Structure 1
């Protein structure tokens, strides 16, 4: 489908968008910062495909308390103007708040078991996401965005993130050397990465992609976790450790800056962050 005529500022070849940060990876994946994209062009591209975005969130046991603000703020900031399908995974279907949705946006509640240990609640998201890719997501959305629930949207999160596979730079480590990254360092674990390997430390709280690529990632991580379990070992940062191993070996096609995953209480508001889009409560 052809784009219509649009009037916007000419991109200048001899003026970089950002002089302060890396905006492309060494494997030529964009790193998404404010100033790198014209959202008007991207909106047109994705609307012409009638794109549908799925957003998964787990609200198990006491984490149902976070849904109201998560969902209300998503309505303000997440893919506004596009088709969105929220998928709320919960052990308490009656506890999901009744949030008023904009046109072209729907919510489905998916009842799942609650594990006793929070580590397992966190980890088993991979199995559950993969199982639901297997039928539901394949037919209903084009992309899946998988996030933590104890968060709020404060600024635009849109189609600029969409790509076959993305990860997000963890806010605690975007300035760190790879030696300092908290990857799993025990060779006995499937998540093992040595001190001399690694591109970035990706956050387990924000990843996604096409349904096919997310199904692959989540299936791979769940299987790695099952091998670790049979061997009596649990990765240092659980699902996030396996995510990082996956993304080292299967490079993402975009990387999101820490604009997309932030904690203002712990880290302030650095000058390199022009927007805080999705933040810890």
Structure 2
């Protein structure tokens, strides 16, 4: 096989939560041996793919810098497939991709209804996972476009199902998580319950898994529309109830999704991807 011990050394980062209360790694800078992993995954000849959506104004603002940065930093040295979903392919910038990078684009019906946006996201992702992505890649990552890769964001992030610790709350106590707190919603997480507050802006796993994340979230979201109720933090609140019930197998630290607005404490040792301005 490939033991956890073989690439993950949580003892290289005592300062922070490296193992979840369920023996699952939370990947921080220094804890991972990407070199070991790269070799290991390369042997498995894995392709990672990554799904980014950008609609209307969001394209000319972000989609490029995001790709550029992904192209440069996302799973370097493995076949990667950019799944770019846009509302108007004309505006789609066809920027030069490096080696082991390839893309395919898709026109989607645009937004606009506040929480149809990220209800469609989930349907489409899953629709694709089933339609091709599952045959195309060994691991899928779905990220918001309004962020930019800053450094190597690599296979150390690969996992069965992978959540992103939300950058603002990682050091916080659950009962203060902007979870959905209304028992009436499919995203209800009561106080006392909860391990981390995950970020909707990145999640991934095997496509089998991501399908299942996108689906349950979709079912959640939909449910909450038929019950005439917006969730406090939208598809993020479902993404979260989800990872409550189906604990992620790997968690990426805020280093993988840092808001520079927070500042940059001693916990953030090497930012892999930052949010946009």
Give the TM-score normalised by structure 2. Answer: 0.94
Q: Would you say 1:195 and 2:213 are equivalent positions?
A: no
Of 41, 46, 55, the residue aligned with 1:51 is 46
Residue 38 of structure 1, CA deviation:
1.1
Aligned to 2:210: 214
Residue 122 of structure 1, CA deviation:
2.5
Aligned to 2:133: 137
Q: Distance in 2 between matches of 1:98 and 1:110?
A: 13
Aligned to 2:160: 164
Aligned to 2:268: 273
Q: Distance in 1 between matches of 2:216 and 2:116?
A: 16
Q: Distance in 2 between matches of 1:19 and 1:150?
A: 31
Aligned to 1:122: 118
Q: Distance in 2 between matches of 1:213 and 1:221?
A: 12
Q: Contact between 2:11 and 2:31, CA under 8 Å: does it hold in 1?
A: no
Residue 103 of structure 1, CA deviation:
2.2
Residue 117 of structure 1, CA deviation:
2.9
Could you report, residue by residue, the CA deviation over 1:129-171 in whole angstroms, capped at 9, with x for unpaired residues? 1111112101111110000101111111000011110101001
User: Structure 2 regions of 5+ residues with no counterpart?
Assistant: none
Residue pairs, 1:1-281, within 5 angstroms:
16-65=11-60, 66-264=62-260, 266-281=261-276
Larger Rg: 1
Could you report, residue by residue, the CA deviation over 1:168-193 in whole angstroms, capped at 9, with x for unpaired residues? 10011001111110011111100000
Q: Contact between 1:60 and 1:121, CA under 8 Å: does it hold in 2?
A: no
Could you report, residue by residue, the CA deviation over 1:175-222 in whole angstroms, capped at 9, with x for unpaired residues? 111111001111110000001100000000010000100111111110
Q: Contact between 1:165 and 1:254, CA under 8 Å: does it hold in 2?
A: yes
Q: Distance in 1 between matches of 2:35 and 2:112?
A: 46
Residue 234 of structure 1, CA deviation:
1.5
Q: Contact between 1:167 and 1:254, CA under 8 Å: does it hold in 2?
A: yes
Residue 118 of structure 1, CA deviation:
4.1
| Local SS of the residue matching 1:251 | coil
Number of equivalenced pairs: 271
Aligned to 1:7: none
- C-alpha root-mean-square deviation of aligned residues, in Å? 1.7
Q: Contact between 2:72 and 2:98, CA under 8 Å: does it hold in 1?
A: no
Q: Distance in 2 between matches of 1:51 and 1:211?
A: 13
Q: Contact between 1:123 and 1:238, CA under 8 Å: does it hold in 2?
A: no
Residue 104 of structure 1, CA deviation:
2.4
